[PDB]
Ligand binder design. Sequence first.
Ligand SMILES: O=c1[nH]c(=O)n([C@H]2C[C@H](O)[C@@H](COP(=O)(O)O)O2)cc1/C=C/Br
Lengths: 284, 263
Amino acid sequence: GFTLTGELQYLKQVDDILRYGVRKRDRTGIGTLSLFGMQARYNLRNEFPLLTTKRVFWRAVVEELLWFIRGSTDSKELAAKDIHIWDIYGSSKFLNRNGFHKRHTGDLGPIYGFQWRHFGAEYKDCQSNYLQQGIDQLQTVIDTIKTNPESRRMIISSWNPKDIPLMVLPPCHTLCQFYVANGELSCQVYQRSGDMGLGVPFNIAGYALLTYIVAHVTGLKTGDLIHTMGDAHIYLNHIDALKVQLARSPKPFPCLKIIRNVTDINDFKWDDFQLDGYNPHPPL
Amino acid sequence: TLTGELQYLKQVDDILRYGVRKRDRTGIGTLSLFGMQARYNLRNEFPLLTTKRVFWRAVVEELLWFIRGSTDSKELAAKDIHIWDTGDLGPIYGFQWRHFGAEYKDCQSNYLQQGIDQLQTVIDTIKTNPESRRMIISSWNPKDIPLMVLPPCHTLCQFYVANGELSCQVYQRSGDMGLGVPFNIAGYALLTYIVAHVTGLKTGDLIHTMGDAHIYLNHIDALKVQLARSPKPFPCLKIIRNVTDINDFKWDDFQLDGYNPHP
Ligand SMILES: O=c1[nH]c(=O)n([C@H]2C[C@H](O)[C@@H](COP(=O)(O)O)O2)cc1/C=C/Br
């Protein structure tokens, strides 16, 4: 291979946004450097693509995925586990200032988890029960992988325009596609908007984890994660930090082991995962 | 740092040299690679492949068929274009582009003001919030998919403005390099030209992303021939009339110059 992969390509990406990126006025008010249309390959064979040049909150990644898997959209459940990444959007101050004054605290609307397990259902609130409503994208993929893995139609999309106005924020990782070859599960994720500073390393971990999880329950080996994105951007108030992180040579990716033989997609716990060798670089 | 049609050709070559044995949905064998991407420049050129003649008139008429939200294949046959061959194809691209989330009945029923007009929405957003990262047209509707004759290959696309130029990245889940992909490239390259013209913007890049990029085992020889050929300079597409309405485009409004494909 003469083309970069893994954390080298990620760093290759932030570098290009730093030299060729375009300054644009962002929704949040603060400016960003932007490039459009990127793609990075992350090998999943015998290693886990958890970025090492700066520490990734691994436990939040795990809990958020299981939070997606159970169809949940109540940020309080994450905060009940000291995972406060969605707390801002669940907070009462945000909900009222953004037209969601009738919704109760934590109600994130029809976010990822809802679209994953019940796409098409009419959303009520994060407390409601929606079982056997909508379309279970996650479970149809698992069924298709077991029945007809040659399929090129194994996709999970969160982009529901009809439900989007109810969402606190449009799905950044809009969809992913699974792919099976040589009894080896692969997964490409399309990310419409990717903040290189915060979200992108967090998402890469999640969809790598998701591929590991699905490949687990389907008896398949993990192939590759392909991280495709649209508006690849770097917030201007992060440039100084990203250039310091840029000089760090990334360490060997860690191992991921599942200590239990989970057969049910909903039956995964935080205590099921073993991460060996994660020795990221010291903070700023 | 590989430009133009050579991007497509290297992709073809890679799936032949590095491609994986994977079975097609119909039973035939294919060579496959998961995850690819190509950047086609739209500045003073149009990425219509030259190493093989592409059905230019169906690219245009199908798009204008998508734009007016038609799911009737008889509408394309009425212009001697039968690439979709009574009539009712189910809630395909046209119904998803203009009426996403509406209740589909048949190809003759009316869906105006029903569902969500993604196409006009991204148009409005370009004139209003060109810095938006949410300008997306998705054709993937798990609800309506079992009623489609064929699931959408081009799942979605995202538009992007920078320095007055309009760029589009399209996600194609499944790419037959032998036939589909070339027709598809020009399909979304043409789309960018249309939305740019309406919005008054320039044309940036078509970013072409693929999932299962594959080659059928019949087409190997016929692609080994095409790869032997030398690429030729891309044509120049000119929108000859000043159209303001996305629905006001006709075949006569397009002038394709300098297209010299191989036999
Ligand atoms: O636009 C296209 N481009 C393409 O390559 N193809 C090709 C891609 C693939 O071989 C086949 C689609 O079958 P599945 O992937 O669903 O099993 O047709 C098809 C289309 C039309 C889609 Br409607």
